[model samples]
Target chain A: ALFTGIIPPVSTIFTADGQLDKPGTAALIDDLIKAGVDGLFFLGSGGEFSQLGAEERKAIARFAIDHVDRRVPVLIGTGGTNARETIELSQHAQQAGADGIVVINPYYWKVSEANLIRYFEQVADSVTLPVMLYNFPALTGQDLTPALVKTLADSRSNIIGIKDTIDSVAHLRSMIHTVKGAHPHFTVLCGYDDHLFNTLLLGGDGAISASGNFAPQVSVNLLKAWRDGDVAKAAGYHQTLLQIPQMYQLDTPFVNVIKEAIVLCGRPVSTHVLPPASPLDEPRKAQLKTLLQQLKLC
Target chain B: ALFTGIIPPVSTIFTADGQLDKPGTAALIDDLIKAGVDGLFFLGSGGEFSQLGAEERKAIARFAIDHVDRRVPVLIGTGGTNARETIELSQHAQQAGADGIVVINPYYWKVSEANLIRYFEQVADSVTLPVMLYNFPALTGQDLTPALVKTLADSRSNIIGIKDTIDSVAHLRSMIHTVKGAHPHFTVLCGYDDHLFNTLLLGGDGAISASGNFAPQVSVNLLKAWRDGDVAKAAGYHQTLLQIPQMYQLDTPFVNVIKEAIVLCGRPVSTHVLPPASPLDEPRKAQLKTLLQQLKLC
Candidate 1:
């Protein structure tokens, strides 16, 4: 079940009518597998798992697992504000034959350290598969600190890794250095698109970013190139990927733009997404499309 | 359908088993209604909407509507990342005979302003009840500017008011003075706790704050006193309310702390929140209880 190489938190694309886009999603999984994504993490911030009902999330997990058919390790983002929901979703992911589950801390209300410990350990104990701790404080509004990571690593057997979305080089270095000493076998994947080179240089495992869904080659090559000590080529690819990130800085629905950019780049996926979450407007898309074209992407 | 005085985004009191404590919640509603609140905004951030499921939200909203017994207007928070889910909850609130629904911009994913307009317009058009735009950028990360408010107000018939949660007084002034001049009835209520006096003074209508659930007297009295031109008396009551606000900044779950502080202040409710959201530990309880005793509130 262990994964190496690139794995994007697969975006949950929707049909025009927006009913999970089952066949489209399954085909996209096959597409991603063929495109050389080492693994698949479904129902993440990319999956709009927060927007989905419990039943819908499980259904998507099962469908992805059944369709991916062991080509890539399937990881489910099984986080909610409560432990019962996390446990329930973790059980579903396990039942769906998932390779692992990515669990974020109890967000919105903010859980204490004890509650945080219980939340992770309890889920890991309940599931047979390994659990990756997600620390994206920008989304959750609480940073899952490295000290807490060390604490969780000490307490739980199945707590194997972290997908830290903290966008800081200094913090990332301290995290990787600290965890390398704690659990040498532990995986530390960077969640940021921009920090992949530095993270890999500091002995990070790999990256799982939203931008990876759009420009997999750039991210995948950048990682491989950097690891191979071709720093200049890695930096060039990283710079190329910045065009996608640039389009995203416009409006808050950057993920929608990310998915839209992927579709525009000739990916066989629908641009329609679940609402409150809508697609990019014409002007922004035109602007983004121009940017993508200039970079020889779209 | 417009609100005149303070409105507390009602808290959801949960039982030990993690289900909604309907009777306890009803009692809290009774207390808020009796203490001269203009409305009950159930299923809001204060109500821990993220913690409860769709069915649970419906149950809480129904209970609140029945308990208030038409004494105060009820606005349910029916916001999710998906528009269909938001519509489903909005319809449920409308069917429950709530006066209106307070719609938050979908959280986790940042939305485009265009999508924001579409979301509000669609929800407003779906139901007969009045719709209030709930913009709390701090939590949702989607700030609805005054211009965007005009766009939304112009589009939807049921678009009635907004709950502006931004803390800046200048921003508040621009929201009311600059934006509302066109449509005078486009009511703007402050979601900020400390800025209520200034908010109402700056021509904003009341507040939908968390602290109001605990000390209805301070919130209600201060708003009323300010409106009545008794600025000195209002200032005194606002000072009394500072204890709860001070406790909120203590890096804990403010919801549980508010409830604990309320119960410690001899309020008619226990602080049994759902899991992932734990009650205050012994030391936290000691601190909150001390704050309550010093105020002679217990």
Candidate 2:
């Protein structure tokens, strides 16, 4: 499997003036790698990829790949509103020796099904490296349904899997059955924290979730427990994991929440995030700590 | 008025390989200049601004201001998800000698109203050049309400006007009454083609519409007719102009349709558009020509 276990869609660290915090970023990645994460996915929605430019993305991709040093596989998000830039970034990721690239569909202007198919085919065609479809409808304003996924996965050999970010397990179940049935080698990773247990049960592979940033150990343990045939042990972590998603509601971007959660979990890195998302105020930090202590995360 | 009469949010010209087409851009501007548009607004939604990076935006800003060459006022679209980049680009537009900057609010992460206000205030404060709020709820995934606009205009003297891009006349009507009632010097332009007549009647200023790209004469005549107290003549042009917006339905980005319309109107520039928006197929182009002829535009 190209992506076997837990891979966190890590939050990016920024200086107060909004420059990339390379030392802070490297420090966070090292902690995740030490926790035995299977892979580290940079530039996901949590990574603030939308707030960055092409040159910034290229710089981050280079630094992430270099610092991780291939200790774990890395996935770079290269999707945008147009295929030209997405192809450019995807090629840069390939040259940077990324293990794979995850592409969210073109946003801001939702294209017709034909145009959407044309976009994904053109991008996937441009890269020889493995590609994972990132389905984030709430932010991207579109959905990648099972029917669409069936058509895409069937045509492209390198189009290997999906990071289904939707809340509906029905969508997840149908997607898993519809695409994976024909291409038995396909991988399916859930995007949310709580979906990990049900995703594994539905024959989906693993998670590239937000919780994997702050609480990597619980999911790492849950996946291991499931693979070890201790279904009871995995279910326990599933309940604990379900409690953590409420933390996301405390901040609008929810990328804001991940950093506060990281520092409380004792990493103590910079909490600075980009605009549209600012640091969590002291009051929200208190509420978050209450939840973390209840979950024994702090 | 900083933005008076028919200022089109012009479609950006791109080559087949997706490079900027300089000569084609100049040709279109020459025609718009001759037809007597009051201003030329670049990098709006129609300009495929979402497809560009920060460097590309700066390049377009420089070209637009230099080429327009103080023959008319130029407004640059300089809004993004983060305040840092928006401020950077706004400052560049000022340095490049743009008459004003149109700022669509932050998208992707729907921030709290406090954050939204903070984002706009910081950007507006960064430059001495005039600022116009861009309200496109469909693409931006957020709306700037009458109350929000009222607050922004009251606090910042340079936050002069807005381009209201909503289907609801009620929104346009209230926005006019709420904001303009206090700041009599403020300018308000309707973003859509059909709203121009109603917007003017509601005490709003001119329009910064998509139609201003291909059919500058009708809007110029409409605004002139209204100003000359010829209501019957203005109403007649409004009926002909309303038929043109159907052209937007023929293409997804609708930028492709504008270039085709510009050619059929006898400009004969490159029909090349950027990705996520491609050349309108032969059938769609033929249908568009049918509409233009029905409206007597071609």
Best by lDDT: 2
Each prediction's DockQ against the real complex:
0.48, 0.60
lDDT of each residue in A230-249, candidate 2, tens digit only:
99999999999989999999
Q: Please give, for residues A53-119, the per-residue lDDT of candidate 1 as tens digits.
A: 8888888888888888888788999997756778999998898799999999876656667777877
Identify the leading candidate in terms of TM-score.
Answer: 2
Backbone clash pairs for candidate 1 read A252-B110, A275-B83
Write down the TM-score of every candidate.
Answer: 0.90, 0.97
Q: Which candidate has the highest DockQ of all?
A: 2
lDDT of 2 at A129: 92
Writing each residue's lDDT as its tens digit, candidate 2 over B1-24 gives 568688888878777777778888
Off by over 4 Å in 1: A110-118, A211-252, A261-267, A280-298, B223-229
Reference-based lDDT, each prediction: 0.79, 0.88
